[PDB]
Amino acid sequence: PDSWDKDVYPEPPRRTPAPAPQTSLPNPVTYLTKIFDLLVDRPVTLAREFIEQQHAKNRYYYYHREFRRVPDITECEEKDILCMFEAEMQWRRDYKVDQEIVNIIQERLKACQQREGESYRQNCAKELEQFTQVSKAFQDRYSDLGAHYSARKCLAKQKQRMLAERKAAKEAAAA
Amino acid sequence: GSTFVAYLPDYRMQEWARREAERLVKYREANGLPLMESNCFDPNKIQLPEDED
Amino acid sequence: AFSAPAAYLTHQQKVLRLYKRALRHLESWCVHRDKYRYFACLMRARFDEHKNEKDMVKATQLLRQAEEEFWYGQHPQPYIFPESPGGTSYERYECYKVPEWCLDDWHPSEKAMYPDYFAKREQWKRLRRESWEREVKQLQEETPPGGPRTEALPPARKEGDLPPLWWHIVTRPRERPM
Amino acid sequence: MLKIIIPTTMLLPMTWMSKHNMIWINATVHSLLISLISLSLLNQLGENSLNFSLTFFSDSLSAPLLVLTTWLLPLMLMASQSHLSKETTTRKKLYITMLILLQLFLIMTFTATELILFYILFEATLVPTLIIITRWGNQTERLNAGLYFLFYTLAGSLPLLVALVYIQNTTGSLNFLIIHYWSHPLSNSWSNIFMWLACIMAFMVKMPLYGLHLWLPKAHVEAPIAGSMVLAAVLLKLGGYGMMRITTILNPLTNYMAYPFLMLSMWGMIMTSSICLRQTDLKSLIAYSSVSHMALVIVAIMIQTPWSFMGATALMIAHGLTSSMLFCLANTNYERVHSRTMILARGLQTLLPLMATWWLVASLTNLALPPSINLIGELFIITASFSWSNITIILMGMNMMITALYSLYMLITTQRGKYTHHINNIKPSFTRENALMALHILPLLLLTLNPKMILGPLY
Amino acid sequence: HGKRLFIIKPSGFYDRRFLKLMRFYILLTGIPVAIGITLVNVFIGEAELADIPEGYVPEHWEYFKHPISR
Amino acid sequence: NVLQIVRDHWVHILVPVGFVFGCYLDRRSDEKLTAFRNKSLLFKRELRPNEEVTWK
Amino acid sequence: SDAPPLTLEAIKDRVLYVLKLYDKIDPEKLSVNSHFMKDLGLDSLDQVEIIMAMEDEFGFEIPDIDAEKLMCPQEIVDYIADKKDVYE
Ligand SMILES: CCCCCCCCCCCCCCCCC[C@@H](O)O[C@H](CO[C@H](O)CCCCCCCCCCCCCCC)COP(=O)(O)OCC[N+](C)(C)C
Ligand SMILES: CCCCCCCCCCCCCCCCC[C@@H](O)O[C@H](CO[C@H](O)CCCCCCCCCCCCCCC)COP(=O)(O)OCC[N+](C)(C)C
Ligand SMILES: CCCCCCCC/C=C\CCCCCCCC(=O)O[C@H](COC(=O)CCCCCCC/C=C/CCCCCCCC)COP(=O)(O)OCCN
Numbered sequence A: 001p002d003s004w005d006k007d008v009y010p011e012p013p014r015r016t017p018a019p020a021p022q023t024s025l026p027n028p029v030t031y032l033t034k035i036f037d038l039l040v041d042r043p044v045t046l047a048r049e050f051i052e053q054q055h056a057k058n059r060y061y062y063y064h065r066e067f068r069r070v071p072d073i074t075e076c077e078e079k080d081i082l083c084m085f086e087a088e089m090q091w092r093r094d095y096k097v098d099q100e101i102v103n104i105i106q107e108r109l110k111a112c113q114q115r116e117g118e119s120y121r122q123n124c125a126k127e128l129e130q131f132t133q134v135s136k137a138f139q140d141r142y143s144d145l146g147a148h149y150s151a152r153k154c155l156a157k158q159k160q161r162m163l164a165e166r167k168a169a170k171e172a173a174a175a
Numbered sequence B: 001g002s003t004f005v006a007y008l009p010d011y012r013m014q015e016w017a018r019r020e021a022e023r024l025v026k027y028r029e030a031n032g033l034p035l036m037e038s039n040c041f042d043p044n045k046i047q048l049p050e051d052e053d
Numbered sequence C: 001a002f003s004a005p006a007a008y009l010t011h012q013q014k015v016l017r018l019y020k021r022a023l024r025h026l027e028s029w030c031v032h033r034d035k036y037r038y039f040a041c042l043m044r045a046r047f048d049e050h051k052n053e054k055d056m057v058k059a060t061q062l063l064r065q066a067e068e069e070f071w072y073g074q075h076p077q078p079y080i081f082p083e084s085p086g087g088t089s090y091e092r093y094e095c096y097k098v099p100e101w102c103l104d105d106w107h108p109s110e111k112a113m114y115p116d117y118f119a120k121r122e123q124w125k126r127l128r129r130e131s132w133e134r135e136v137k138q139l140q141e142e143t144p145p146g147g148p149r150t151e152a153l154p155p156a157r158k159e160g161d162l163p164p165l166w167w168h169i170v171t172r173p174r175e176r177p178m
Numbered sequence D: 001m002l003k004i005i006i007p008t009t010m011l012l013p014m015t016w017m018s019k020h021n022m023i024w025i026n027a028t029v030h031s032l033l034i035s036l037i038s039l040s041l042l043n044q045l046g047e048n049s050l051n052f053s054l055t056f057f058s059d060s061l062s063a064p065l066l067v068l069t070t071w072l073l074p075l076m077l078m079a080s081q082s083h084l085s086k087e088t089t090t091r092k093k094l095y096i097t098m099l100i101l102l103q104l105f106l107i108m109t110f111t112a113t114e115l116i117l118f119y120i121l122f123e124a125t126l127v128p129t130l131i132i133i134t135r136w137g138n139q140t141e142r143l144n145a146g147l148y149f150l151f152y153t154l155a156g157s158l159p160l161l162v163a164l165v166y167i168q169n170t171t172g173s174l175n176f177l178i179i180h181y182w183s184h185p186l187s188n189s190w191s192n193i194f195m196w197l198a199c200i201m202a203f204m205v206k207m208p209l210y211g212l213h214l215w216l217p218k219a220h221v222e223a224p225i226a227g228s229m230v231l232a233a234v235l236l237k238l239g240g241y242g243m244m245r246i247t248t249i250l251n252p253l254t255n256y257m258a259y260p261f262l263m264l265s266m267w268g269m270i271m272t273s274s275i276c277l278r279q280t281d282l283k284s285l286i287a288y289s290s291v292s293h294m295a296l297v298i299v300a301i302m303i304q305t306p307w308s309f310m311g312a313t314a315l316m317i318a319h320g321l322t323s324s325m326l327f328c329l330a331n332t333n334y335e336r337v338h339s340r341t342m343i344l345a346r347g348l349q350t351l352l353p354l355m356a357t358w359w360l361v362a363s364l365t366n367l368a369l370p371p372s373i374n375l376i377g378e379l380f381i382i383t384a385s386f387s388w389s390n391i392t393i394i395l396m397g398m399n400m401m402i403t404a405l406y407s408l409y410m411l412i413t414t415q416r417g418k419y420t421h422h423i424n425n426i427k428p429s430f431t432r433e434n435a436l437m438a439l440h441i442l443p444l445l446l447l448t449l450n451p452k453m454i455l456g457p458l459y
Numbered sequence E: 001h002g003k004r005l006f007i008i009k010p011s012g013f014y015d016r017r018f019l020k021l022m023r024f025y026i027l028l029t030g031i032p033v034a035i036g037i038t039l040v041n042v043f044i045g046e047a048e049l050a051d052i053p054e055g056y057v058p059e060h061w062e063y064f065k066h067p068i069s070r
Numbered sequence F: 001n002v003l004q005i006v007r008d009h010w011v012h013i014l015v016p017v018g019f020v021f022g023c024y025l026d027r028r029s030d031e032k033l034t035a036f037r038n039k040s041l042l043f044k045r046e047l048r049p050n051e052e053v054t055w056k
Numbered sequence G: 001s002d003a004p005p006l007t008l009e010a011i012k013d014r015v016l017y018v019l020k021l022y023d024k025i026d027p028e029k030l031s032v033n034s035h036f037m038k039d040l041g042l043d044s045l046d047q048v049e050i051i052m053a054m055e056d057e058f059g060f061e062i063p064d065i066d067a068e069k070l071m072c073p074q075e076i077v078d079y080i081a082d083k084k085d086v087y088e
């Protein structure tokens, strides 16, 4: 369906076998699906076509809101309240977007596990690896900030992580 | 009142965040970027203090 | 249940209560009727071998060893009639019992159904109203001074009188109301 | 925010100029209209807040509390209509005036953007409640009850005021937005420890915290029904809202200052729950159950995690509705029997079946049956506590079991068994009581369909 | 067999009346609401997403999809 | 009957009039804070040909 | 359930039926008003056994305080009728 992007939500080509009856006994499943089609799918389709033509008679649009980029907390003065307000709002929007990215990857993983069947342990390696990377990045960014989280605390956590990384790199180089 | 609350417009911006995340994931998978990055702010704009210990 | 209790049980009542309990538990042990008949005749023979004894002291020494022997071999899961206090349907119909006074709170559209029943009910109410004023004085003069000695009630002695405190005994809900 | 405040103020002249026989009708209708108007505050953003002016602002933490506050007033009027029948017109108008003034003070307190303003209204809520308890209370203990409810509160809140002005002489502001944006860490110092205690104890005493809870059973069992409703549903949540607001300036001291209270809560919720197992008064049992739920809310706030805050908000709303319903049911029994003892009126399911259904639904909601929002809050708090320490589950688990027990205990003693023979004055339930229970219980089951409304600002 | 007996029970008039009244008022307002929602869904709603034409600045209510929300 | 039921039901206008007055009061407060209208870095916009203010 | 509504005649008939199968008492001598100790020359243990046979016959138990003072078939019938709410 065109309602979603196929690249953002990938799917395998979905190869299905062909009916190969081996006996002369008529299977009840095919007849049941034919009567289901005739008694259910046709009236539902007709009602849908009526509703779709009514919707086509009245077509109107809504838009995705675009947000400009503003200076972040790393270029705000100590007490400049307006810049910190703008940077805090931008950081909160970015936090929400990152949460939704993690949600997309988790949906991919769950769909893979259901789809692959008994061979999910081997056939869902890529989704597991992607989720591992995204989870690691999200945990590095946002974990342990508390309920009163803010952009300043995230910046402090990043600064401490970079200090630790720099110290470890200098210690390893000067080994 | 229940009907009014049910149809409250999306000022919390859930679907907006979903669309933004979709576009970001598409772009980063297309160009090979590693999805989410570990650093929230790029280190080019942070001036760490020299320890010199 | 219906009979008023006494201050104590005499020796004869205790012996008879033991006899009934022992026979019931022996029946619970002996499921089949012929086995129960045989062992119940044996228990009857064992019970009346001291029937003719005269002194109280040893007769009380018996019925004590008898209680101990009963408690040792008392069949920890005896048969209980289903309506008895331990039975599987003891208070089963207790939730269907509604007091009569609830009918006084019915809507007039509800009392419009069943007019004959409510006419008879009004007759009963007026009968109770007169009988109560008679009953209070009857109980007042029939009671010994210092208060009752036993919770037994007298009958009516006059012609138009009713037994004192009769309303809540006569107007019991039912054994199986619904 | 004045679109809600001004009509609430106009309730007073409308009450006083009303006809002698039309006070209840007008008050109920216009309170319901004010609740409908206040429903519009629920449209919140994922961004900062609804900053209406320099004085008032609204959040997704404040909006559900405001809606609950505005919704409770018509229910309180309906509950008070019965036992105030033989009262003079002037005193009935004074009662309604006290209720309106309480609603006004609460409305302003939730939306105040200044800590000092918040303190003033947070204390102003005391006077109407004290008057209601000590004037229209029934027993002679009410006077003592009132004293307790007063002094405990004041004993906690006088230090807070000091701390507050001290803070404003150091940071220069008590505005909550500036306080949040300019937050600075609290160093481990004795002065900082005592500032923490001063900022925390006033909100702890009103939750109430275990060991500081002695005023609550007295006040709730001695108050009239409307007083019990407002005390259990709204006034307890003032401490939770205050602690949620003020913990932003207390870090990182809370990392280790929270230990004595957490223990006092985690053990305390056990004790109070067990207390409910041996209680001879219905109102006392309901009050102790309130203490247990608020202990869970205290744990949630002290843990200071997103899931903790979401669970605390949801549990506050759910407990408000549930405890108000339980108090109303107990009062509907009391007005028939005049005893307030659990084992006097028995087997009431046979005489009042629909009221028995209301009892069952209220007990199920207090028992936290999924997917009620009571269980949503409880489960979020339990998960956050498990992340805090895996051992906590033990205590949490125990509480769950105990809660169910006493809840069903209260349902079995009063509704099941055989009716008491000599009690012959149990009349059919009025439409007013049934409507009161329905208006309590329908919003809960409706809210379970859109839990995001009551999950707070961290959703 | 004409052994029909009177069943003593509490009055069901008031509970039934309350249930009827509550159902009546809830339905009184909710049936028109359901009908209106159905008509709006069938005949009007479900706007479709589009790109913002250049030089055009949309109104704040044009960023929402459902007609009732708009 | 008009001029008789008014003396008993004039009370029912107080709360709605309070609501309208409260809305009007809210609007007045908004005017005072217009210090940054169309001046934020996020919503800075060029005015339409027949537009004086971005919001009211 | 499907239990027929037993009557006073049925109760009396069943009580007399059980008593006539007690070989200690002569079926010619006994009647509805025939006393147990004086008219038929029975003992207290015999009375206990008779009460137990009644209980087995009618499927319910008579408490001992009430059972100990049931000395005629007529009072047994009356007790069963009062317990089971028999009209006629
Ligand atoms: C009694 C016998 C049975 C008769 C009834 C039979 C019919 C059964 C139906 C009853 C329940 C069955 C469940 C069916 C659910 C369908 C409706 C549901 O989908 O709507 C929900 C909506 O529910 C409401 O949001 C929640 C109700 C609001 C509660 C507010 C309370 C009202 C004020 C009262 C005072 C407040 C007191 C408490 C203060 C906190 C969730 O909708 P959602 O998928 O999300 O989006 C709506 C559509 N959009 C996308 C266009 C936006
Ligand atoms: C009654 C019902 C319940 C009411 C509510 C109860 C909750 C209030 C409990 C108060 C919380 C604790 C207060 C202080 C905690 C700080 C930690 C400190 O006490 O522990 C050690 C402190 O050691 C000793 O505790 C020193 C103080 C000993 C004297 C205090 C009295 C001890 C018991 C008093 C309890 C009375 C409470 C009721 C008052 C009426 C740590 O050693 P040290 O590293 O050196 O100090 C660190 C702090 N620095 C950095 C500022 C220096
Ligand atoms: C339900 C009953 C509860 C009663 C209230 C319990 C809470 C008590 C909290 C302490 C009371 C005083 C709070 C002080 C107000 C905050 C201001 C502040 O923190 O400033 C401090 C001042 O801190 C103090 O002076 C506090 C000293 C304590 C004096 C009052 C003692 C009250 C009782 C103390 C023990 C009980 C506290 C816990 C009680 C638990 C509940 C019973 C720094 O002062 P500076 O000199 O300017 O800075 C230092 C660098 N030059």
Ligand SMILES: *OP(=O)(O)OCC(C)(C)[C@@H](O)C(=O)NCCC(=O)NCCSC(=O)CCCCCCCCCCC
Binding pocket: C011, C012, C013, C015, C016, C022, C023, C025, C026, C046, C047, C048, C050, C051, C052, C053, C058, C059, C060, C062, C063, C066, C067, C069, C070, C071, C073, C074, G043, G044, G045
């Ligand atoms: O004429 P009645 O009024 O019927 O009097 C009956 C009787 C005279 C026998 C009796 O009431 C009485 O008064 N007896 C006087 C002496 C007396 O009874 N002394 C006590 C004898 S005790 C006894 O009978 C031995 C009991 C043996 C049975 C033990 C039960 C164990 C069973 C274990 C479970 C299966």
